Design a protein around this ligand. Structure first.
Ligand SMILES: N=C1N[C@H]2[C@H](CS[C@H]2CCCCC(=O)O)N1
Ligand SMILES: N=C1N[C@H]2[C@H](CS[C@H]2CCCCC(=O)O)N1
Ligand SMILES: N=C1N[C@H]2[C@H](CS[C@H]2CCCCC(=O)O)N1
Ligand SMILES: N=C1N[C@H]2[C@H](CS[C@H]2CCCCC(=O)O)N1
Lengths: 123, 121, 123, 121
């Protein structure tokens, strides 16, 4: 449901995600990362699957953040693929891939993989 | 390099990606998969990092497709993270994560990881 | 150090890992998984990097479990790549890839990715 | 299929893997990488699942290499998870995770993911 996702979220690393989920399955917002070559907010764009889900199943969603804004250019993009679980303590569990632009030779070391969990605070 | 991301791309599996790259890093288009629980085109939205690149680096980009359209709703989303390379033979090399919405019991086995290489050929 | 790794470990899913770390960097043991197509123990084999690590850095290690024993054959193999952190509450943080043997056509859906954290109980 | 895993393999990067497959699922050998902070051969140990396969499935296998030998100690370990396919042109298709030992601060960026395809060519 767009509503429950829409809000301010923070993860275990201390980063901020402000997102608005549109009725058509769209997600737009700003991301603030507590770590890496990142300063201030960055635009985020993604999609979520408005599931009929009568199973107590999480909603599958994903978003990209290219790390370039008017103050910094990290030359990298992170995609998060995860599941949103609501209820009283709503969480978004994810796994992410962070690709940095590289030369052909160094492409084998371009992607980092990891996992983040977001806890919601405000709508 | 430059506007070269915009176009129609195909991966090893036969899927098609039609993207438009906006001047401030936005990516919009449609995706049609050749494999999996999917049918027709799907809306995709992403971002690419416009940058200086004296060393011939690729352009970092990424996009998401929630597999729900007017025909199917696979209850999943794939994100592709990768980089575009130009030249006579442009290509987008990516690694993707596909997450399906599971119940708590099955969360351990919710995410598939893989890799696709797209060319305009 | 071989010693601290050697012992009984359990993860958030409730699986057992009994391992003995050899001085040469070898790891052998039995794994008992609380989930998936698995029954009773399975042989595990891996390696760990006997780091001089004066930084409070984790020890990098990895191991494979092919899921075939005398009672079941799951036709799959899981590799865990992680870091061992000791101290009073020693943990092994990992990320894993689970590949199932597939036909050529279905190879794009052969690998699962996830992450497990093990808490130690006994040497 | 059968003992065909045993041999000398090479991946796209030019690395070499020499493995021996034991009858009860063990894998032993050496690995020499062509890229990264590595020098010479390294001990590898793994497992492969010996099975029935009426549908022409690959053989699931996996192995670990801790990048420490008498020459270097990169303080990391790579695990390859994948499957072997036989036929006139045998290949081992894998996805790998490389974890480096970080301090707590850097744990988020400790693991590289990638993919290699090995052939006896
Ligand atoms: N909140 C998070 N921060 C790190 C992880 C994945 S994205 C990452 C920060 C990256 C900042 C930009 C960069 O260093 O390239 N999640
Ligand atoms: N073009 C590609 N198709 C598969 C991979 C990445 S996503 C995938 C298709 C998944 C379809 C929907 C599903 O079955 O969940 N590349
Ligand atoms: N302790 C764990 N159990 C699951 C994860 C990764 S391995 C997995 C169990 C797999 C059992 C065999 C199978 O289902 O193929 N960790
Ligand atoms: N043959 C391959 N070499 C690279 C990939 C997987 S592991 C890697 C080399 C890493 C060397 C040690 C290091 O730099 O950490 N495939």
């Amino acid at each position: 449901a767009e509503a429950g996702i829409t809000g301010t979220w923070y993860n275990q690393l201390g980063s901020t995600f402000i997102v608005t989920a549109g009725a058509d399955g769209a997600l737009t917002g700003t991301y603030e990362s507590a770590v890496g070559n990142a300063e201030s907010r960055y635009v985020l764009t993604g999609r979520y699957d408005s599931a009929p889900a009568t199973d107590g199943s999480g909603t599958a969603l994903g978003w990209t953040v290219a790390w370039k804004n008017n103050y910094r250019n990290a030359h990298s993009a992170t995609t998060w693929s995860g599941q949103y679980v609501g209820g009283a303590e709503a969480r978004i569990n994810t796994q992410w891939l962070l690709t940095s632009g590289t030369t052909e030779a160094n492409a084998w070391k371009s992607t980092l993989v990891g996992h983040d969990t977001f806890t919601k605070v405000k709508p």
